[PDB]
Design a protein around this ligand. Structure first.
Ligand code: HEM
Ligand SMILES: O=C1N[C@@H](Cc2ccc(O)c(O)c2)C(=O)N[C@H]1Cc1ccc(O)cc1
Length: 394
């Protein structure tokens, strides 16, 4: 006898398991067991993943309901599982979007200058260099301090909460609450700090004192700062790191992007499509009985939308494992989700990766792994797939 198939399949972010194509072909919606012991429906075809993400009756907020089957333990207060809904209800959605666009004056120049300075430092130190800890993650942290309007010197400590805040654990994490409460206290102090007048926190600080937002809670204003720093830094740092592995393993593509940097945006869109940075399916709780393919999902059940199931589906993306810069449907992947919860930071995430890759290819055109690829250490029981160190030479 065997136990029910368990998720996730592998923490490795450099290869897709053969199991994904097997499930997609044979049972694109099927039952699995998560790390908490709950059962869930794993959805792995592009058609069914889109159907779940576009039907609001599959709710993100309701995954925090007491007694629900869980993917993992919460690392935030349950009301934060409704974060974007709370922001929208507060009338803050437009202001938050405007503050996180990469089009802000001098932001792209700041990204280029920061990437170039980090790379010059690595070149001075000499090979091997760690592209995660000494490139992708500090570039993400510096970008988010600038977008938030907070001091660059405060970034590293806020960043150190993330190895715990984005864990995918069977059980509650005592350290996640200690860091959450401290990071909220920091952002509450930022709202009260007269020197913070730019970026997202400068704008929220002004709206907080505007009569049209007098009843928005101080809890929400501080929560927006913690959550946008955390989700943005973990997502951009982890995507850039794993996209750099995808590129280093494709020297013909690396050479083409070095020669024709105008192709970098199309290259980043394909690097997003084949990305394995999300370690778990996106979770939703059914709020009604809903037919999904051959399964009638019942009210109260957990559904997991496997992004790589959709993004490597050959019925939507022919020769899915190949980076092809001339696809006719290039942005139709699900790397930023779909529907109500579509990533609000998509343009910023695209720009961070494009500028990071452009700077790396200019400075280190001969970039290559300095260790055999199997020697990368993949972080386990985490919401992202990332190597602990990314050692390169050039
Ligand atoms: C390469 C970069 C990024 C990737 C791949 C990424 C991916 C995603 C995905 C797949 C979702 C949907 C989650 C779901 O439906 O359950 C999402 C949501 C979100 N992302 Fe991003 N993200 C990235 C960058 C960012 C940045 C830069 C920020 C903010 C500065 C951000 C903030 C958020 C937030 C707050 C949500 C929740 C939205 C909602 O629930 O409506 N993301 N992201
Ligand atoms: O539960 C949520 N949390 C936050 C994202 C977030 C920010 C900081 C953290 O320490 C964390 O673990 C998760 C949110 O905006 N919306 C919801 C849904 C969500 C979860 C994860 C994610 O990557 C994006 C959104």
């Amino acid at each position: 006898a065997t136990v029910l198939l368990e998720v996730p399949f592998s923490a490795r972010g450099d290869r897709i398991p053969d199991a994904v194509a097997e499930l997609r072909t044979r049972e694109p919606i099927r039952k699995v067991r998560t790390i908490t012991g709950a059962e869930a429906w794993l959805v792995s075809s592009y058609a069914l993943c889109t159907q779940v993400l576009e039907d609001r009756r599959f709710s993100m907020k309701e995954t925090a309901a007491a007694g629900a089957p869980r993917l993992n333990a919460l690392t935030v207060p349950p009301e934060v599982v409704n974060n974007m809904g709370n922001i929208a209800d507060a009338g803050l959605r437009k202001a938050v979007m405007k503050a996180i666009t990469p089009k802000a004056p001098g932001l792209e120049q700041f990204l280029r200058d920061t990437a170039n300075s980090l790379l010059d430092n690595l070149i001075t130190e000499g090979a091997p260099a760690d592209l995660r800890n000494d490139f992708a993650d500090p570039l993400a942290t510096a970008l988010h301090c600038k977008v938030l309007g907070i001091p660059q010197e405060d970034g590293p400590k806020l960043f150190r909460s993330l190895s715990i805040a984005f864990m995918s654990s069977a059980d509650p994490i005592p350290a996640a609450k200690i860091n959450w409460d401290r990071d909220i206290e920091y952002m509450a102090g930022i709202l009260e700090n007269p020197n913070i007048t730019t970026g997202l926190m400068g704008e929220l600080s002004r709206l907080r004192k505007d009569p049209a937002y007098s009843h928005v809670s101080d809890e929400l204003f501080a929560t927006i700062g913690v959550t946008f720093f955390g989700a943005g830094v973990i997502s951009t740092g982890s995507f850039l790191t794993t996209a750099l592995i995808s590129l280093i393993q494709r020297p013909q593509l690396r050479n083409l992007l070095h020669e024709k940097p105008e192709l970098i945006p199309a290259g980043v869109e394909e690097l997003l499509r084949i990305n394995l940075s999300f370690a778990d399916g996106l979770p939703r709780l059914a709020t009604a009985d809903i037919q999904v393919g051959d399964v009638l999902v019942r009210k109260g059940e957990l559904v997991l939308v496997l992004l790589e199931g959709a993004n490597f589906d050959p019925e939507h993306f022919p020769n899915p494992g190949s980076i092809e810069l001339d696809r006719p449907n290039p942005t139709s992947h699900l790397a930023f989700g779909r529907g109500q919860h579509f990533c609000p930071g998509s343009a910023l995430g695209r720009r961070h990766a494009q500028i990071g890759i452009e700077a790396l290819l200019k400075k280190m055109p001969g970039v290559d792994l300095a260790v055999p690829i199997d020697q990368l250490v993949w972080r386990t029981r985490f919401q992202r797939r990332i190597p602990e160190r990314l050692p390169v030479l050039w």
